Amino acid sequence: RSRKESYSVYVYKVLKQVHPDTGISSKAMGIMNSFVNDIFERIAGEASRLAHYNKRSTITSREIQTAVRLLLPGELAKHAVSEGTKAVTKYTSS
């Protein structure tokens, strides 16, 4: 009677993608929620700050990309940027 949402469905799907024989405890699935929420808040705060510095009023893919380049280290940023660009390219073909 106090319906509260989380990310565990999608985390479970991704897990079944990368390791389709492994389970997960009930505390680790809370830890993944906390992790996702943390990264979400970081990226969103950084994109907000970026849009404020550039006198814009909207948040676009360019802000998200620059925020990711600001926050991820080394080859993580390269792979994340490639993933993001591939995703946007696939979405626009619709």
């Binding site: 830890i31 993001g84 979405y91």
Partner: protein, 107 residues
């Protein structure tokens, strides 16, 4: 003559939810407007990072001849990555334990 719905995560080809992140972006006081390609990018990044951690986590789980991933395995995954350990340098994991190390002088 309807257009039976097709989720945005399906269009992007992702598992993470695009509409829920869109809603959280709008009701979160981040900007006045939100573009159409920002949630796809962010969900792709979140899914990539999740897969990147979870694979090494299932590996650390399956190293100790275990079936379920526990927090000890998540912690070992975090600390055994010279970038993930810099991204999560000041985070504490409950029931995570410590990194096994002994100083050479103490042997």
């Amino acid at each position: 003559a309807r257009a039976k719905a097709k989720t945005r995560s399906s269009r992007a080809g992702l598992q993470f939810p695009v509409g829920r992140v869109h809603r959280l972006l709008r009701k979160g006081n981040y900007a006045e407007r939100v573009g159409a390609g920002a949630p796809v990018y962010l969900a792709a990044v979140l899914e990539y990072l999740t897969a990147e951690i979870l694979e090494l986590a299932g590996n650390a789980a399956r190293d100790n001849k275990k079936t379920r991933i526990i927090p000890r395995h998540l912690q070992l995954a975090i600390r055994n990555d010279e970038e993930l350990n810099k991204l999560l340098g000041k985070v504490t994991i409950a029931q995570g334990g410590v990194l096994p190390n002994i100083q050479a002088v103490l042997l």
